[PDB]
Amino acid sequence: SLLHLQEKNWSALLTAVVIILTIAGNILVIMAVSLEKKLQNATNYFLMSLAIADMLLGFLVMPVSMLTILYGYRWPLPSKLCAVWIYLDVLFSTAKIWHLCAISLDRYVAIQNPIHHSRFNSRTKAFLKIIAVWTISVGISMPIPVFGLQDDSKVFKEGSCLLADDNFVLIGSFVSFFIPLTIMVITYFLTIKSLQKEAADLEDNWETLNDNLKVIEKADNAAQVKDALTKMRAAALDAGDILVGQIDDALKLANEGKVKEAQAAAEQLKTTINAYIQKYGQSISNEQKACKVLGIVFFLFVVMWCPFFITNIMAVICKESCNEDVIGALLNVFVWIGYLNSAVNPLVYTLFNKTYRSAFSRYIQCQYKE
Numbered sequence: 001s002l003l004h005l006q007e008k009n010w011s012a013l014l015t016a017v018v019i020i021l022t023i024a025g026n027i028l029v030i031m032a033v034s035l036e037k038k039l040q041n042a043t044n045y046f047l048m049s050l051a052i053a054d055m056l057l058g059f060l061v062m063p064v065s066m067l068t069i070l071y072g073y074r075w076p077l078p079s080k081l082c083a084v085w086i087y088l089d090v091l092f093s094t095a096k097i098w099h100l101c102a103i104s105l106d107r108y109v110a111i112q113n114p115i116h117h118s119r120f121n122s123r124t125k126a127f128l129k130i131i132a133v134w135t136i137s138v139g140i141s142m143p144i145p146v147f148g149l150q151d152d153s154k155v156f157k158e159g160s161c162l163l164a165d166d167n168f169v170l171i172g173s174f175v176s177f178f179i180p181l182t183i184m185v186i187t188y189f190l191t192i193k194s195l196q197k198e199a200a201d202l203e204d205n206w207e208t209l210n211d212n213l214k215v216i217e218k219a220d221n222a223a224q225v226k227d228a229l230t231k232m233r234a235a236a237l238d239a240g241d242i243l244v245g246q247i248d249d250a251l252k253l254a255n256e257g258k259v260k261e262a263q264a265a266a267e268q269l270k271t272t273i274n275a276y277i278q279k280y281g282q283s284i285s286n287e288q289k290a291c292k293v294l295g296i297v298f299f300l301f302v303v304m305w306c307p308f309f310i311t312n313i314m315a316v317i318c319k320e321s322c323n324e325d326v327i328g329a330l331l332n333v334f335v336w337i338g339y340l341n342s343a344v345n346p347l348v349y350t351l352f353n354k355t356y357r358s359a360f361s362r363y364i365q366c367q368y369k370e
């Protein structure tokens with residue numbers, strides 16, 4: 001006889017906590033993007049869809065995962081509900097990683113194509129990209145019901161419902177989890193470098209505009225102002241229209257010979273430059289702030305699923321050499337480290353965004369009026 005309820009009830013109280021923090025955390029994120037209007041961009045739109053994936057993992061996968069621990073890891077439901085539960089577990093995790101990849105991808109293309117980002121601002125464009133990812137994730141996870149329902153040996157390992165098939169655990173791990181992991185760690189690295197270069201390029205054009213504002217207010221002739229405005233106008237085009245015609249206003253005074261009159265115009269440009277420099281120089285500050293926080297989302301996904309990901313692959317490499325009972329007893333812990341990651345995507349936003357933090361606080365006092 002089997003399917004016995006046991007006294008594994010340290011686990012029952014601990015796993016219940018993780019389910020609510022997932023469900024309550026990611027509901028507040030879905031409510032934040034749906035209601036708060038400082039969050040209406042493509043990156044925050046993905047984070048909602050990430051939190052829909054996290055929350056449905058809290059509803060559908062994590063209670064059943066708890067329920068198995070309550071019946072000694074012998075599987076209490078119907079046997080054709082084993083292959084459904086693996087399919088949802090793997091679908092929500094595959095949808096998370098391909099979101100996290102696609103954010104880091106969409107963020108990088110936003111910097112290399114500033115003009116394209118204005119065109120790609122559309123919520124419809126964002127939703128199309130999400131709907132690309134979910135239908136990729138349903139595409140990748142689809143062997144688990146199509147084959148597993150047909151053969152109980154691919155989803156049961158001795159009354160235990162788990163992905164027993166080893167070509168599913170191997171090929172899936174590299175198709176669905178190092179192809180979008182590669183693209184995430186390449187494009188996060190290059191996003192840091194594109195915002196390092198353009199911050200470094202703005203300090204270049206800060207010091208050459210500030211250098212020619214020394215030159216014009218020293219100068220004697222209309223050739224030492226004309227050249228010095230020609231080097232301002234060229235290196236003001238390198239920060240892109242607003243200021244160029246005001247330099248062209250100053251350029252025609254140097255081209256006629258009105259030097260004291262061209263020098264006075266250049267002093268009027270000074271404050272125009274400090275306005276346009278404090279603006280775009282706070283823009284790079286904000287993107288590098290956002291890139292840092294999205295990195296913590298990216299880093300904690302990778303770290304918390306990493307003990308589950310390595311040990312599941314060591315189940316397949318030492319299929320002979322190792323304690324299958326100990327590897328089975330570690331994966332049962334290691335899956336819940338990765339489940340816990342559904343609870344921490346919301347908490348990150350709270351610590352690191354005052355817009356998410358304010359919104360969460362108001363909803364806890366039941367205040368939706370923005």
Ligand SMILES: NCCc1c[nH]c2ccc(O)cc12
Pocket residue numbers: 065086089090161162163331332335
């Ligand atoms: N999401 C990976 C499949 C899965 C679901 N529950 C599990 C429990 C144990 C295990 O080894 C694997 C699983």
Ligand SMILES: [Mg+2]
Pocket residue numbers: 207208211
């Ligand atoms: Mg200098």
